[PDB]
Amino acid sequence: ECKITECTYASDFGGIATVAYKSSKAGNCPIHSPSGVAVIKENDVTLAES
Amino acid sequence: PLNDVAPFGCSIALEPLRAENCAVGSIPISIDIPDAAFTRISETPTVSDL
């Protein structure tokens, strides 16, 4: 599940959010939003167990 | 003496004739804090479910 933390209606990366990951193994994971509504500066996140 | 009839608990002294601590009214305070003391929202812990 995805939870917003604090979004700023601005031009810089003011939007932040926390994702409650529910994974099984550990490894890299690319992140991307296909929609053009939001742009994510973060590129890669390693996944731990939940 | 005016030192004992002044309302709002004023106080006077051998001075430029100030009236110390005349508690009355409100003050429109506006303050610009330094930006350095701010810390990113994404770094502070989340304290939900309290």
3-state secondary structure A1-50: CEEEEECCCCCCCCCEEEECCCCCCCEEEECCCCCCCCCCCCCEEEECCC
Rounded Cα distance, A15 and A3, in Å? 12
Token output for A30: 């690319």
Residues of chain A found within 8 Å of residue B46, distances taken between Cβ atoms: 5, 18
Give the CA distances from residue A3 to residues A16, A18, A44, B48, in Å, rounded to whole numbers and listed in that order. 9, 5, 19, 12
Resolution value (Å, 1 decimal): 4.6
Task: Record the tokens describing residue A17, joined without a space.
Answer: 């959010």
Distance from CA of A5 to the nearest CA of B (A): 8
Sort out which chain B residues have CB atoms less than 8 A from A5's CB and list them.
41-42, 46
CB A29 within 8 Å of CB A11: no
Contacts B41 to A, Cβ<8 Å: 5-6, 16
Quote the CA–CA distance of B22 and B8 in Å, as a whole number: 6
Query: Distance between CA atoms of B13 and B50, rounded to whole angstroms?
Result: 52
Report CB contact under 8 Å: A16, B46.
no
CB A19 within 8 A of CB A3: yes
Q: Using CA atoms, how far apart are residues B19 and B5, in angstroms rounded to an integer?
A: 13
